[PDB]
Amino acid sequence: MKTVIQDTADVYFKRKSDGKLVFTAEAQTASFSQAISEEKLRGGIGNKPLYILKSEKEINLTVKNAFFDLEWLAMTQGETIQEETKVKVFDREHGLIVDDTNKVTLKGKPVSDVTFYNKKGLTYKIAVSTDGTYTIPTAFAAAKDKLTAVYQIEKVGRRLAIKASKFSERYEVEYRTIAYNPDTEEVYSDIYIQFPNVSPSGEFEMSLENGNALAPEIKFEALADTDTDEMAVVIEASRDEN
Amino acid sequence: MKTVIQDTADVYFKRKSDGKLVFTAEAQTASFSQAISEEKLRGGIGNKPLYILKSEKEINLTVKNAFFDLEWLAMTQGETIQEETKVKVFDREHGLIVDDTNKVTLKGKPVSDVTFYNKKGLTYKIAVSTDGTYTIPTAFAAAKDKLTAVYQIEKVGRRLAIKASKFSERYEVEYRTIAYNPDTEEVYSDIYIQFPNVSPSGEFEMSLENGNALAPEIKFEALADTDTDEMAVVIEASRDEN
Amino acid sequence: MKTVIQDTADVYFKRKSDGKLVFTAEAQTASFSQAISEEKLRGGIGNKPLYILKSEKEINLTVKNAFFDLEWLAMTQGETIQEETKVKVFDREHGLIVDDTNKVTLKGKPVSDVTFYNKKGLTYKIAVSTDGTYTIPTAFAAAKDKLTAVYQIEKVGRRLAIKASKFSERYEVEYRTIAYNPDTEEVYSDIYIQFPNVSPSGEFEMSLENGNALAPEIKFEALADTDTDEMAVVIEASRDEN
Amino acid sequence: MKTVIQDTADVYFKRKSDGKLVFTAEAQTASFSQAISEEKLRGGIGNKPLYILKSEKEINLTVKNAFFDLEWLAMTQGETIQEETKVKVFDREHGLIVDDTNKVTLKGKPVSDVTFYNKKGLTYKIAVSTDGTYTIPTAFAAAKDKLTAVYQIEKVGRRLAIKASKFSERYEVEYRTIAYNPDTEEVYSDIYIQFPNVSPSGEFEMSLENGNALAPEIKFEALADTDTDEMAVVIEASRDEN
Amino acid sequence: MKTVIQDTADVYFKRKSDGKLVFTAEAQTASFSQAISEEKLRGGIGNKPLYILKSEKEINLTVKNAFFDLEWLAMTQGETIQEETKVKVFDREHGLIVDDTNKVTLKGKPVSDVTFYNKKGLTYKIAVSTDGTYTIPTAFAAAKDKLTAVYQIEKVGRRLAIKASKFSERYEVEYRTIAYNPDTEEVYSDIYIQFPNVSPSGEFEMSLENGNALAPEIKFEALADTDTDEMAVVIEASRDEN
Amino acid sequence: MKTVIQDTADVYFKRKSDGKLVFTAEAQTASFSQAISEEKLRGGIGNKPLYILKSEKEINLTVKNAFFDLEWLAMTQGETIQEETKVK
């Protein structure tokens, strides 16, 4: 039937070897495209086409989401997320006042050398102290002198590593959307597009801009199924015949 | 006669091998273009042209519709559509509450091992139970914990397969529009443009964007008729000569 | 005299073989351009230009109209319009109600197999019936079931054929426009740009879009005259001296 | 001295061979530009620039006017305007009523075959009538059938011919503008830019569109003076020292 | 120290050979840019980057002013302005009324042949009259008809010549800007970017458009210093330590 | 015949799917308006009109009543009214 489509799709990815399944229900774009290589074989006295050679049926996929998820980066890199891993990160402390005896007390847990910044953008790298007391020289600051300390601390959280030699596995993807009825303006059917053998593409970009909500985007390349030699399947199951 | 054209065309595709007929009457763009290869011969004292060599007349077609139709994808792929085929698709159930004896009961028809998602984005893959009752570990949820289950179900619907080695067959296209009369502002004639031997082009793209109405588009390449050596026929039939 | 030009040109084309004359007085753009190939001959100490070599003087024409005319397509293809020719076109009837005995009566004159479309976009290709009575199967429709029939009919009208190995002949073109007087704001003369020997160009494009008035456009390539070696003759004839 | 320039330039062209002088006082743009070719000669350990080779100093000019002059086209083509030359142009008149005895009387001075157009866009090419009476066939028109006649007439006017093997000779150009005073707001100086040996470029384009005032444009290439080796001279003459 | 820059730079150029000093304090843009050539050397098993080769550090400069100055053109051309030089320019006289005895008297000082223009754009070139009386033929003008005269006059003023075999020599450029304090909103320091050894680039363009203020622009290429090998020296001297 | 109108209208809405009928007889304004899209074709020497392109006939209605009625909100929302429901 001639139907009207006016929405995007819910996307499901499944890994082949393991079966780990990812779904996105807050997508903003789901697209796929097909390209093909054509050539004409000419000849004869009139120099007219005698044959058409066609090959290289290629399909590409693109998905753009509305929220952020680390598993997308996992899929792109073909890696695994290790939960509850200890990490070394940076931290900043503003407003340390140098006391009368020129000593500053830190209220954090440094792991490496602490670097101090005065109001004129000058640095002083002092090693870590036990009690958390640092003797700031007279040439650096005086009484009632707000300063800054930049030190490394310890945290725990999920860690994903990007290596220079590990690539992606093979996946199975499906888009799902709905199709309306022009005459009656009610939902007519559900449309499923299934790709049974795809390869994630390693090209991606993440740009953080102030005041801009980040929308990550991923791409895939579809390949022919090993057994059935299928690249995609389009299904338009109705909501009355199920 | 000099007439005014201000409308689109109703398109009638038709396969040649069997005569299967497709028609669209809600089009949004119907266009065709012609290209040719030219060269100049030069010689003598002065480098003046002596001949113009012309060859390789080519014609292309483009159609853009307002509704969706699986038959267009079938036409591009040169494949048939199976009716009432059983397919395995994905489904989602939200809001399962884990009871006092950590039992979760599904109200669907699982076919493959279910996957459970807690509120912190963690997965648990468990095989399908007989009574649809699953024992969620206490490390996953305890009580009053909305969970999500993603499982595969079965449905009946139409099916079109895109294969890596199957290509398109030949068709016969024809547009149809009306031409107005500048003096009297009444329909003067009907204009039919008939292409008797075309080949659908495998290049196509389907992009689903939220809030945007999908308008599919197809392309064709016109070839000379086998016997008459025609490539296109333009006909203007008045409404008084019938 | 220094004059102001603010209008388009009335265009006259004339075939050289037989004198067949076409004119357009509702033009929308008339332009012509000249190109030339130049190079520098250098040498000596300092690498200074010693000569300039010029050749390859070319002129092109472009005309864009406001109405539609099959004669322009005839000029581009170098063919002839064969008026009052019988043609085979498509037609469609909506609303055929299947009666109690499952018979549908057509109100047109089919020439080929009729194709029936039910409410769910399914096809049934039946042959031609003498009495115009068709027996629709029970699996296709029932009582009070509006159906659609697509069949081929016969018409008569002007036929133009586009051939894969037929090109255009030579022509003679002339523009005409008026020039004003910047002091008196009154018409002063008429400019008659004349091209003695042009050749139509095969490039062409027709694009039908809903809500858009079609404006066809044709292009020409000017060539040197056979004897006088002219390529354009700009004439500014005053209307007080004729 | 630091001044402000906010206008175009009055332009003067002079031919070298005979001294024919053209001037434009209603220009809309007068520009000139210089280009040069530079290369770096490197070597040694570290690959550092050892020398710079620069040559091929080129200068180009562009002038865009607000009115139309045939002398500009003559200058570009390097030709001469012939005054009071007899020419054969096209003319057309609408509304010839076919009388009771199917005779149409022309009110012009045809020179070649007259072509008649009925209201249905059909042509009839009749020869020249001595008295100017033409017997239109009854199959072509009847009583009260307004027709159209297209025929060639004779006029006199200025003729400029464009040949395929004739080019432009050398010229001498000068721009003049005025420069204000930032402090006193009054005119301070006259700026003269003189080019003593230029060659008009053969590239030009003339496009006529409805409702658009035509502004012709011309280009030149400046060349070194044959004895002084000057490409341009900039003169800044005050209005108090003259 | 983190500061805010929100202005342009006062620019100073100095010639190296003699110390001729030019400055501009009315600028609209002062920019410099750096480019470098990079390449990766790979090898081994896995095709991993083994080394990075970097070379060809290049720095470019661009300055855009708000007023006009012949000194900038001299700097680009590497020439000198010869002040108080006698020159021969063009002049125009409108409104010459031909008297009863067809004599026209000029009010200027011609040096070459005077060219007369009638109201219909026709020219007549006559030699220089001793008393400034010219006998216009009766075929050109009769009485109470205003004509136009174009003749060359003599003036004195500055003169910059552009030759085909003269280029620019080395200079020394310096910008100056001020920086603000984000906390106090008061001027904090002055920034003096210094280039010790640059080379003017002979690629400029001067375009005069009606109603458009002219802003000239110049470019430079910075080169390494002979001894210290420096290419630029950014300095951020403060306004309280100086 | 040339007649004088000096009053409002009684309005009768009616659904098509089921035939549910709503009527108002205390209206205060009943209006309808028509709009259309026009354009001109131009060409030749003189830039004279050659055709008027017309399309997109559109009609809108507005009704303003004097009393309150929940069925009007139901009509706007395309929703049904449940009777005797317990609410907090």
Side-chain angles (χ1 to χ4, degrees), chain A residues 1-184 186-242, chain B, chain C, chain D, chain E residues 1-184 186-242, chain F:
Chain A
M1 193 180 171
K2 301 141 149 78
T3 42
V4 183
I5 299 185
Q6 62 182 309
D7 282 320
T8 180
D10 309 20
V11 190
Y12 305 84
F13 320 85
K14 187 148 85 34
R15 210 218 302 261
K16 282 287 215 41
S17 68
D18 315 331
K20 175 197 189 3
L21 177 87
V22 180
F23 86 100
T24 82
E26 321 295 8
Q28 249 157 39
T29 292
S31 81
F32 77 102
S33 76
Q34 161 190 353
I36 177 152
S37 179
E38 301 145 79
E39 178 192 0
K40 289 184 184 180
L41 183 59
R42 324 191 91 101
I45 282 186
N47 193 63
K48 318 155 309 310
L50 317 172
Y51 204 50
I52 309 206
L53 308 148
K54 302 186 169 190
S55 73
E56 292 312 301
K57 179 174 304 187
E58 305 186 0
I59 305 196
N60 309 293
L61 293 66
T62 308
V63 185
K64 167 147 95 127
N65 197 336
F67 295 159
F68 174 74
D69 180 355
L70 193 55
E71 285 100 51
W72 282 45
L73 267 154
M75 301 165 28
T76 288
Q77 293 315 314
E79 256 266 19
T80 61
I81 293 170
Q82 338 198 21
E83 305 269 347
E84 305 317 278
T85 308
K86 215 83 177 151
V87 280
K88 281 259 295 302
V89 291
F90 274 97
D91 199 5
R92 282 169 27 245
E93 205 154 353
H94 286 317
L96 318 175
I97 313 174
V98 197
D99 63 357
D100 316 309
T101 70
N102 287 7
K103 214 182 301 283
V104 284
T105 54
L106 251 172
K107 322 299 301 313
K109 278 281 289 214
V111 173
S112 68
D113 315 298
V114 169
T115 298
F116 282 94
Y117 291 92
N118 56 355
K119 55 170 159 64
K120 303 174 32 194
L122 287 176
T123 76
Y124 180 41
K125 189 175 40 178
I126 186 169
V128 76
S129 74
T130 72
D131 194 331
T133 36
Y134 307 86
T135 47
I136 283 297
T138 36
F140 211 73
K144 301 174 187 175
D145 284 5
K146 280 79 182 305
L147 258 74
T148 307
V150 189
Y151 47 90
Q152 262 174 353
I153 70 172
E154 193 90 328
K155 272 198 163 195
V156 84
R158 340 175 63 201
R159 181 184 186 274
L160 156 78
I162 296 176
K163 286 177 314 308
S165 286
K166 213 169 178 180
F167 298 103
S168 50
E169 308 178 76
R170 304 281 190 91
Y171 283 73
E172 143 168 29
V173 183
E174 158 176 336
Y175 309 159
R176 175 230 150 209
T177 166
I178 67 173
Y180 279 79
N181 235 32
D183 316 318
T184 81
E186 72 176 60
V187 191
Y188 176 70
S189 66
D190 309 286
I191 299 186
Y192 303 80
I193 309 169
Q194 316 183 344
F195 310 77
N197 206 32
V198 298
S199 171
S201 180
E203 171 166 289
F204 95 113
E205 158 151 350
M206 196 181 158
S207 181
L208 304 156
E209 279 150 50
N210 63 346
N212 253 309
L214 175 74
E217 171 186 290
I218 197 178
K219 326 177 132 45
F220 303 90
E221 201 284 344
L223 298 157
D225 197 7
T226 280
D227 313 328
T228 326
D229 206 69
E230 288 175 348
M231 276 191 184
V233 177
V234 186
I235 296 142
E236 205 254 349
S238 317
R239 288 166 93 111
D240 276 328
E241 82 196 29
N242 300 355
Chain B
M1 180 167 164
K2 302 164 190 174
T3 44
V4 178
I5 298 186
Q6 53 175 323
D7 282 328
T8 322
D10 315 344
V11 195
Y12 305 89
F13 325 84
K14 163 194 172 186
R15 188 142 49 161
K16 302 170 72 64
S17 88
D18 49 51
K20 174 175 170 45
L21 193 89
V22 185
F23 100 97
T24 179
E26 321 295 9
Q28 254 166 32
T29 289
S31 75
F32 79 100
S33 81
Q34 165 198 2
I36 192 187
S37 185
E38 302 155 62
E39 186 196 350
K40 286 187 187 181
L41 247 184
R42 306 220 164 201
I45 302 181
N47 221 16
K48 314 162 311 313
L50 321 173
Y51 211 168
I52 308 92
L53 295 137
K54 304 183 166 191
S55 80
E56 277 153 28
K57 179 168 312 190
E58 299 207 0
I59 289 195
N60 323 94
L61 301 63
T62 310
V63 187
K64 178 183 174 184
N65 197 347
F67 295 158
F68 174 76
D69 188 331
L70 190 56
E71 281 256 10
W72 287 42
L73 268 159
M75 165 170 353
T76 288
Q77 298 310 143
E79 189 121 6
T80 57
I81 291 172
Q82 283 64 0
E83 292 275 342
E84 314 295 82
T85 310
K86 204 92 161 153
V87 282
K88 213 165 57 180
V89 295
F90 280 99
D91 191 51
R92 274 173 318 110
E93 199 147 57
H94 284 322
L96 318 175
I97 55 184
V98 186
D99 61 357
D100 315 309
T101 61
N102 54 7
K103 289 299 206 298
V104 277
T105 37
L106 275 174
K107 311 297 300 303
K109 204 62 151 73
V111 172
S112 72
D113 36 7
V114 191
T115 295
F116 285 93
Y117 293 90
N118 58 355
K119 68 178 175 181
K120 293 170 21 179
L122 285 173
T123 76
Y124 179 41
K125 187 222 314 295
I126 171 171
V128 49
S129 285
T130 68
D131 208 344
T133 292
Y134 307 83
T135 36
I136 280 298
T138 180
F140 221 65
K144 260 166 265 195
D145 316 281
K146 323 298 183 61
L147 292 202
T148 280
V150 194
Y151 45 88
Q152 301 207 70
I153 67 173
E154 276 264 63
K155 269 195 161 196
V156 171
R158 334 171 71 181
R159 183 186 187 271
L160 155 77
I162 300 180
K163 294 181 306 341
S165 265
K166 188 90 174 42
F167 297 119
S168 50
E169 308 320 321
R170 309 249 159 135
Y171 282 72
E172 298 171 12
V173 192
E174 144 166 50
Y175 305 161
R176 180 216 145 237
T177 165
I178 66 172
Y180 278 74
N181 202 311
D183 304 341
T184 70
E185 320 205 319
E186 65 148 40
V187 190
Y188 173 75
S189 76
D190 307 282
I191 302 183
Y192 307 82
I193 311 162
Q194 323 179 346
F195 314 82
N197 190 303
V198 302
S199 174
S201 178
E203 297 239 350
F204 97 106
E205 155 138 357
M206 192 187 172
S207 186
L208 300 157
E209 272 143 43
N210 73 326
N212 272 355
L214 180 62
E217 157 171 321
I218 196 172
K219 310 200 182 323
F220 302 91
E221 201 284 344
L223 311 143
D225 201 0
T226 87
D227 42 58
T228 319
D229 206 72
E230 263 150 28
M231 261 185 165
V233 174
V234 188
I235 293 141
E236 161 156 10
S238 177
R239 289 202 166 178
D240 293 288
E241 317 161 357
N242 297 356
Chain C
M1 184 178 170
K2 340 213 175 183
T3 45
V4 184
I5 299 186
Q6 52 171 324
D7 278 343
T8 321
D10 310 344
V11 196
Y12 306 84
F13 322 86
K14 169 187 169 184
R15 190 148 67 195
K16 276 194 139 186
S17 285
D18 55 17
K20 197 213 181 332
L21 176 75
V22 188
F23 90 100
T24 170
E26 331 278 15
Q28 209 139 307
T29 294
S31 79
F32 79 102
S33 77
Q34 163 197 354
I36 194 186
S37 69
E38 311 154 60
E39 50 206 48
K40 284 194 187 67
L41 193 49
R42 330 190 84 111
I45 295 189
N47 206 58
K48 45 199 57 178
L50 321 155
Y51 204 83
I52 302 86
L53 293 125
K54 299 181 169 185
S55 69
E56 273 176 70
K57 178 174 299 186
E58 315 203 331
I59 285 194
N60 316 300
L61 293 68
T62 308
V63 188
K64 182 214 240 216
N65 199 343
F67 295 159
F68 175 74
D69 188 332
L70 204 63
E71 285 263 29
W72 288 41
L73 260 158
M75 301 175 28
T76 311
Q77 306 307 151
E79 300 263 3
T80 50
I81 292 172
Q82 323 184 24
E83 296 208 2
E84 304 292 346
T85 311
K86 278 139 182 52
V87 283
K88 273 274 295 307
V89 306
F90 281 97
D91 198 7
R92 33 181 280 271
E93 275 183 61
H94 287 313
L96 313 182
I97 309 173
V98 201
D99 61 358
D100 317 334
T101 65
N102 291 12
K103 273 192 221 313
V104 278
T105 53
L106 259 163
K107 323 298 298 179
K109 294 302 102 183
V111 170
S112 70
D113 317 288
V114 183
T115 293
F116 284 92
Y117 290 93
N118 58 354
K119 217 67 57 61
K120 306 192 311 176
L122 284 163
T123 75
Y124 179 42
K125 184 159 50 60
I126 192 174
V128 197
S129 76
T130 64
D131 203 2
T133 58
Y134 300 89
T135 36
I136 287 295
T138 36
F140 212 70
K144 301 173 186 175
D145 283 4
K146 328 276 191 84
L147 289 200
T148 281
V150 190
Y151 48 89
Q152 281 185 303
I153 72 173
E154 182 101 338
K155 301 272 283 296
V156 86
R158 334 171 71 191
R159 184 184 185 274
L160 164 80
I162 295 176
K163 221 154 308 305
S165 197
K166 183 100 173 51
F167 304 109
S168 50
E169 31 197 2
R170 304 296 175 90
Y171 272 82
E172 143 172 27
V173 186
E174 158 166 330
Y175 305 161
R176 183 202 88 96
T177 178
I178 68 174
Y180 279 83
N181 228 55
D183 318 307
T184 39
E185 306 207 349
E186 79 178 38
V187 170
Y188 171 79
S189 49
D190 314 305
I191 298 85
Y192 294 86
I193 311 156
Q194 297 181 2
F195 307 78
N197 195 249
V198 316
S199 159
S201 182
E203 314 284 311
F204 184 60
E205 180 175 359
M206 219 187 136
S207 181
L208 305 147
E209 311 167 2
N210 50 310
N212 256 39
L214 175 74
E217 152 189 310
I218 191 166
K219 338 179 84 62
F220 301 93
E221 203 281 344
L223 291 164
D225 197 2
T226 302
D227 48 278
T228 40
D229 214 73
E230 308 169 1
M231 263 173 38
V233 181
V234 190
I235 295 155
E236 191 223 60
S238 173
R239 80 181 31 225
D240 270 355
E241 92 199 354
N242 310 357
Chain D
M1 151 181 173
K2 328 219 211 269
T3 47
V4 182
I5 298 189
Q6 51 167 323
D7 291 303
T8 40
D10 310 343
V11 190
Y12 305 84
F13 321 84
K14 195 168 84 45
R15 189 145 42 142
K16 293 284 228 41
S17 307
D18 56 76
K20 180 175 176 25
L21 190 144
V22 198
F23 88 101
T24 82
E26 321 295 9
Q28 284 196 345
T29 293
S31 78
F32 77 102
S33 80
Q34 161 190 325
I36 199 184
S37 63
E38 301 146 79
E39 293 163 356
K40 281 197 188 67
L41 178 62
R42 305 161 160 294
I45 292 191
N47 213 14
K48 326 158 303 293
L50 306 180
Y51 203 50
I52 311 198
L53 312 156
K54 38 184 49 183
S55 58
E56 287 168 21
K57 176 175 300 186
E58 311 196 350
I59 292 194
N60 309 301
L61 300 77
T62 303
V63 189
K64 177 151 97 83
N65 189 343
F67 296 158
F68 176 75
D69 278 359
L70 198 59
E71 306 93 22
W72 281 45
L73 264 153
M75 171 186 328
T76 288
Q77 289 318 311
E79 270 268 29
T80 51
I81 290 171
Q82 333 209 27
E83 296 277 345
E84 308 310 274
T85 310
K86 267 298 189 181
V87 285
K88 209 168 55 178
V89 297
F90 282 95
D91 193 53
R92 136 189 71 91
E93 45 183 298
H94 301 318
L96 316 176
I97 282 274
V98 197
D99 62 357
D100 317 329
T101 66
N102 64 17
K103 268 186 216 318
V104 285
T105 55
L106 258 166
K107 323 297 299 180
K109 275 283 281 213
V111 162
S112 66
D113 320 316
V114 171
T115 294
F116 283 93
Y117 291 92
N118 55 356
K119 69 175 179 300
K120 213 186 314 305
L122 286 173
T123 79
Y124 180 41
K125 190 172 66 266
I126 188 169
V128 195
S129 173
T130 70
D131 194 328
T133 56
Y134 306 85
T135 46
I136 283 296
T138 179
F140 194 87
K144 250 173 282 295
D145 295 4
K146 313 185 175 179
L147 293 201
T148 304
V150 188
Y151 49 92
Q152 280 186 305
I153 71 173
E154 268 264 299
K155 274 194 162 196
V156 84
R158 334 172 78 192
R159 205 177 154 285
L160 160 74
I162 297 178
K163 327 194 82 63
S165 285
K166 175 92 171 63
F167 308 101
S168 56
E169 29 181 283
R170 304 321 191 61
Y171 278 75
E172 143 163 27
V173 191
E174 155 147 339
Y175 306 162
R176 172 201 106 75
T177 165
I178 67 174
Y180 275 47
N181 224 351
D183 316 317
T184 88
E185 315 98 30
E186 321 305 357
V187 168
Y188 175 76
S189 185
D190 309 285
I191 311 267
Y192 302 82
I193 309 170
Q194 315 188 344
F195 309 77
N197 203 27
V198 304
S199 181
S201 178
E203 313 239 336
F204 94 102
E205 154 159 56
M206 202 185 155
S207 183
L208 305 153
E209 324 161 31
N210 48 338
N212 255 265
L214 174 73
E217 182 181 283
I218 197 178
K219 319 180 160 286
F220 305 89
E221 166 110 14
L223 282 205
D225 189 69
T226 204
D227 65 87
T228 319
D229 206 69
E230 290 177 347
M231 291 205 178
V233 176
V234 189
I235 294 136
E236 198 302 345
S238 176
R239 282 198 173 178
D240 293 288
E241 322 152 0
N242 301 355
Chain E
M1 162 65 158
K2 304 142 171 213
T3 45
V4 180
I5 305 201
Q6 66 193 84
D7 284 328
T8 321
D10 310 345
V11 192
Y12 306 84
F13 320 86
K14 175 163 111 171
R15 210 213 303 247
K16 276 205 138 188
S17 76
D18 53 8
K20 189 207 179 359
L21 181 68
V22 196
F23 87 102
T24 175
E26 302 305 20
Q28 290 191 321
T29 294
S31 81
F32 74 104
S33 80
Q34 178 193 308
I36 186 187
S37 181
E38 292 146 90
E39 175 192 0
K40 288 187 187 183
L41 177 65
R42 341 183 75 102
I45 295 194
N47 217 13
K48 307 158 319 300
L50 301 173
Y51 194 11
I52 306 94
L53 313 147
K54 301 182 169 188
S55 55
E56 291 176 60
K57 179 172 305 185
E58 298 186 359
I59 301 196
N60 301 349
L61 302 76
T62 301
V63 185
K64 178 181 172 181
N65 200 342
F67 293 158
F68 179 71
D69 198 350
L70 199 61
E71 281 266 10
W72 288 41
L73 261 167
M75 164 171 351
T76 297
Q77 296 311 329
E79 213 96 348
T80 49
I81 297 172
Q82 321 190 43
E83 295 211 0
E84 300 315 294
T85 307
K86 208 86 180 143
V87 284
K88 208 166 57 179
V89 298
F90 283 97
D91 199 6
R92 275 168 29 246
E93 205 152 352
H94 288 145
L96 269 46
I97 306 175
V98 186
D99 62 356
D100 312 358
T101 58
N102 54 17
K103 257 171 183 63
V104 284
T105 55
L106 268 166
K107 321 298 298 181
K109 275 263 301 183
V111 180
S112 69
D113 315 298
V114 182
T115 296
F116 286 91
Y117 291 91
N118 58 355
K119 263 188 35 171
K120 297 167 45 187
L122 286 173
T123 77
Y124 178 43
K125 47 193 313 299
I126 191 175
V128 197
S129 171
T130 69
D131 186 356
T133 56
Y134 306 85
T135 36
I136 280 298
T138 180
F140 217 64
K144 293 180 181 177
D145 40 8
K146 325 193 151 163
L147 264 70
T148 286
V150 185
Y151 47 89
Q152 283 188 304
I153 68 172
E154 274 264 294
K155 270 191 161 196
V156 86
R158 324 171 91 181
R159 181 180 183 288
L160 161 69
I162 295 179
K163 294 184 306 319
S165 286
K166 253 283 296 161
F167 312 98
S168 50
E169 34 175 81
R170 314 301 200 71
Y171 278 70
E172 149 169 38
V173 186
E174 181 216 340
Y175 305 163
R176 184 202 88 100
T177 325
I178 72 175
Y180 278 76
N181 222 348
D183 325 299
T184 76
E186 321 310 20
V187 180
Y188 171 78
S189 55
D190 316 305
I191 317 199
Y192 304 74
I193 317 166
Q194 296 181 3
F195 312 77
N197 190 270
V198 301
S199 160
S201 178
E203 284 213 16
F204 76 98
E205 173 174 359
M206 203 184 164
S207 178
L208 308 146
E209 296 158 53
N210 60 305
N212 197 84
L214 175 74
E217 165 186 301
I218 196 175
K219 306 180 178 306
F220 304 92
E221 170 140 5
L223 292 177
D225 205 328
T226 75
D227 40 284
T228 41
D229 197 60
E230 310 168 359
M231 268 163 151
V233 175
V234 191
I235 295 158
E236 204 253 353
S238 169
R239 280 196 176 180
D240 268 352
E241 87 196 13
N242 279 287
Chain F
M1 164 153 207
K2 302 164 190 174
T3 44
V4 178
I5 298 186
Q6 53 175 323
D7 282 328
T8 322
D10 315 344
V11 195
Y12 305 89
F13 325 84
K14 163 194 172 186
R15 188 142 49 161
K16 302 170 72 64
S17 88
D18 49 51
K20 174 175 170 45
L21 193 89
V22 185
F23 100 97
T24 179
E26 335 280 10
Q28 253 166 32
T29 289
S31 75
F32 79 101
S33 81
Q34 165 198 2
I36 192 187
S37 185
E38 302 155 62
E39 186 196 350
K40 286 187 187 181
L41 247 184
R42 306 221 164 201
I45 301 182
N47 221 16
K48 297 166 183 182
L50 303 173
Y51 210 170
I52 308 92
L53 295 137
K54 303 184 166 191
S55 80
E56 280 154 64
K57 179 168 312 190
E58 299 207 0
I59 289 195
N60 323 94
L61 301 63
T62 310
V63 187
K64 178 183 174 184
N65 197 347
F67 295 158
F68 174 76
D69 188 330
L70 190 56
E71 271 90 44
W72 287 42
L73 268 159
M75 166 171 354
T76 288
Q77 298 310 143
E79 189 121 6
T80 57
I81 291 172
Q82 271 93 40
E83 292 275 342
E84 314 295 82
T85 310
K86 203 160 195 175
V87 281
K88 213 165 57 180

